[PDB]
Write a protein that binds this ligand. Structure first.
Ligand SMILES: Nc1ncnc2c1ncn2[C@@H]1O[C@H](COP(=O)(O)OP(=O)(O)CP(=O)(O)O)[C@@H](O)[C@H]1O
Ligand SMILES: Nc1ncnc2c1ncn2[C@@H]1O[C@H](COP(=O)(O)OP(=O)(O)CP(=O)(O)O)[C@@H](O)[C@H]1O
Ligand SMILES: [Mg+2]
Ligand SMILES: [Mg+2]
Ligand SMILES: [Mg+2]
Ligand SMILES: [Mg+2]
Lengths: 310, 310
C-alpha cells in the first residue's frame, strides 16, 4: 500500500474544475487593460449538453500581482451566484497556465458597446432601430433584478456600468464583472482606504467622500446606467474632469436627462440620485415598479419572483 | 515582480475549505470499519454564526486506497446538495492530515441506534416512549423528501438504511452517508460489475440479480427502512444467511410486517416491495400520500413543496 501518500497528494476535487483540453478558443471578444476575453466552445461542461458556447476570461502574463489577486477573487465570488440575470460561472481551469475562467457566452457583448452600435451613424450598426421604450424598461428590470440578487447575497458590486452589463443572444442583460465586488454581510457596507482607481462618474457622493460603498451606492450607479441607456452610451459628464465630477457630485450635482429621455426612465433616475443614500430605492422596488410591463418569461426566471426572494 | 510564480503556486481557493484550527473535536460519535465520526465545534464556518456544533468525518491511517478514494467521492457529491432532509456539508479540511469532512451535527445520531434506544428494555433508554404513529409518519415523510431531492438531482443512494438516516436534536431525520451514491443523469441507472460488499438485506431483487440500481431500488430500501422503524431496528431476515436472502428476494420474497405494524405503514411497504421496479412509487408520491398529517413546518422546509420541485 501507498495509502499514506494519498492524503498528501490527491485532494478533494474542485467541482468547478474543467480539463483544459475541453476548451476550444475561437476569437477575442475583448481586451481589458490586463484581461483577455475569448469566445470559445467547451465539450461536456454542462450535464446533458454535449457542447456549450462559452466566454473565457484570462489574465495576460504581464498581469501584476495585484491584478492576479483580483482575478482570483473575482473567480471565487462568482462560484456563489445562481441567477438568470447574473453572468453564470461554468468552470475554471487551474491545472497549468494560463488560468481560465469559463462563463456563459453573452453573444452581443457588453451593453455599452451594444448601445453605441445602435446609433444610426455607427459603422458597426446591426440593422435594427435604437432601443424602444419597452426594451429599455426590460433592460432596466433585468439589471435591477440581477443587482437585487447580489444584494440578497450581501455583496455590493461597486462597478455597475453599461460596460459591465452583458447582453445575450436573446438580448437579455445580465450583471458581470465582479473584480470590484465585496462581501458586506456583517456590516452592510464596504469601506475603502484611499488609493485605488475607481471611475468617479458612476459613483455616489458618499463614496466619493468617505469611500463607503453600499447597495444604495450601487443604486446610484444604476441611475447612471439608465442614463447610458437613454443616451446610447455617451460619456457621463463629458468635458468635465474626474476631479471636477468628484466635487460637483459631492456638492449635490448629478447628470441631466438625455435628450428625449422617456418620463418613466427620468423618474427612476431621480430616485437613484437622491443625495441621502437612505432615500434611494432598493433594486427589489425598482423591479416592482416595472413588473407589469415585461416579457411574459420574466416571472419564470427572475430573482424577484422566485421563492429565494423570501 | 514574481507574478510569473503566482499562477504556478496559488490557485482559486476552494469555497469549502475551512482552516483546521477553526475545528475543536469533543468526542467520538461513531467508528465505522475505517471511518471516525467526531462531535466537534467550529469557529466561524457559517456566516452570522460565531460558533457551530458540527460532526466531523475522517478516515483512519489504516484506510485502504479504495477507502480513501470512496471518502474522496463521498465528500464531492455532498458539495452539490442543499436540502433540509439531507445531511448538510459545511466544510472540508484538505490542508494537512487527516482530511476532515465537516457536517451539520445530527444530535441523536443515526436512526437505527436511536430506534434501539427506544426499546423499553434498552440500557440506554432516554425516558420517552417508542415512536408514535404520528412520529413514524413524520419520519417516513422526511426520509422520502430527502430521497426525492437526491433523485431530482439524478443520484441513486444505493445504501439507504436506518444506520444512514441521521436524527437531529429536534428529531428531524435526514439522509446521510453518500459513499455508495452514484450519478445516474445520462442513463437513469448505475450498474455494478460483480465484487463489492453491499448489504443484500436492503436490496431490490433486480439489484441482487443484475447489479442494477435505480431510484426504484432506493424505494425498495425505503420499505426496509419503514420495517426497521416499525420493528425498532430488528435485523431484517434474522436467522437467514445473506446467501439465503439473495435467493429468497430474487424469487419474489420480502419481509413480513412487524408485530402491530400500523396499517398505513404496511400499505407503503407493499408499494415499495412490488417486484416490478416500474410499479413501485416515487419518493415524491410517498411524500404526497403523507402530506396532510405532518408538522406545520414541513411545507416551509421540504423539497416537495419548494419551487425547485418544478
Ligand atoms: N460572458 C461574456 N460573454 C461575452 N462577452 C464578454 C463576456 N464577459 C466579458 N465580455 C466582453 O469583454 C469585455 C470585458 O469584459 P469584463 O468587463 O469582464 O472585462 P474587464 O477587463 O473589464 C474585467 P475587470 O474590470 O475585473 O478587470 C466586455 O465589455 C464584453 O464585451
Ligand atoms: N452528521 C452526523 N451527526 C451526528 N452523528 C453522525 C453524523 N454522521 C454520522 N454520525 C454517526 O456516526 C455513525 C457512522 O456514520 P456514517 O454512516 O457517516 O459512517 P460510515 O462509516 O457508515 C460511512 P461509509 O458507509 O461511507 O463508510 C452514524 O451511524 C452516526 O450515528
Ligand atoms: Mg479590465
Ligand atoms: Mg469590465
Ligand atoms: Mg464505515
Ligand atoms: Mg453509514
Amino acid at each position: 500500500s501507498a495509502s499514506d501518500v494519498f492524503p498528501s497528494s490527491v485532494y478533494v476535487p474542485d467541482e468547478w474544475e474543467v480539463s483544459r483540453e475541453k476548451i476550444t478558443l475561437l476569437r477575442e471578444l475583448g481586451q481589458g487593460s490586463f484581461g483577455m476575453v475569448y469566445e470559445g466552445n467547451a465539450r461536456d461542461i454542462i450535464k446533458g449538453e454535449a457542447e456549450t458556447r462559452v466566454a473565457v476570461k484570462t489574465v495576460n502574463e504581464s498581469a501584476s500581482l495585484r491584478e492576479r489577486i483580483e482575478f482570483l477573487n473575482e473567480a471565487s465570488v462568482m462560484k456563489g451566484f445562481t441567477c438568470h440575470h447574473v453572468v453564470r460561472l461554468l468552470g475554471v481551469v487551474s491545472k497549468g497556465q494560463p488560468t481560465l475562467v469559463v462563463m456563459e457566452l453573452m453573444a452581443h457583448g457588453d451593453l455599452k458597446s451594444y448601445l453605441r452600435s445602435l446609433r444610426p451613424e455607427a459603422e458597426n450598426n446591426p440593422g435594427r432601430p435604437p432601443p424602444t421604450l419597452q426594451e429599455m424598461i426590460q433592460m432596466a428590470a433585468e439589471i435591477a433584478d440581477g443587482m437585487a440578487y447580489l444584494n440578497a447575497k450581501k455583496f455590493v458590486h461597486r462597478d455597475l456600468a453599461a460596460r459591465n452589463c452583458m447582453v445575450a443572444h436573446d438580448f437579455t442583460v445580465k450583471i458581470g464583472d465582479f473584480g470590484m465586488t465585496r462581501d458586506i454581510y456583517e456590516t452592510d457596507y464596504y469601506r475603502k482606504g484611499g488609493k485605488g482607481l475607481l471611475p468617479v462618474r458612476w459613483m455616489a457622493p458618499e463614496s466619493l467622500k468617505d469611500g463607503v460603498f453600499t447597495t444604495s451606492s450601487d443604486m446610484w450607479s444604476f441611475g447612471v446606467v439608465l442614463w447610458e441607456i437613454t443616451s446610447l452610451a455617451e460619456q457621463p459628464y463629458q468635458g468635465l474632469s474626474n476631479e471636477q465630477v468628484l466635487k460637483f457630485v459631492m456638492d449635490g450635482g448629478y447628470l441631466d436627462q438625455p435628450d428625449n429621455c422617456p418620463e418613466r426612465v427620468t423618474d427612476l433616475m431621480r430616485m437613484c440620485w437622491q443625495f441621502n443614500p437612505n432615500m434611494r430605492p432598493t433594486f427589489l422596488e425598482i423591479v416592482n415598479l416595472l413588473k407589469d410591463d415585461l416579457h411574459p418569461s420574466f416571472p419564470e426566471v427572475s430573482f424577484f419572483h422566485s421563492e429565494e426572494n423570501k
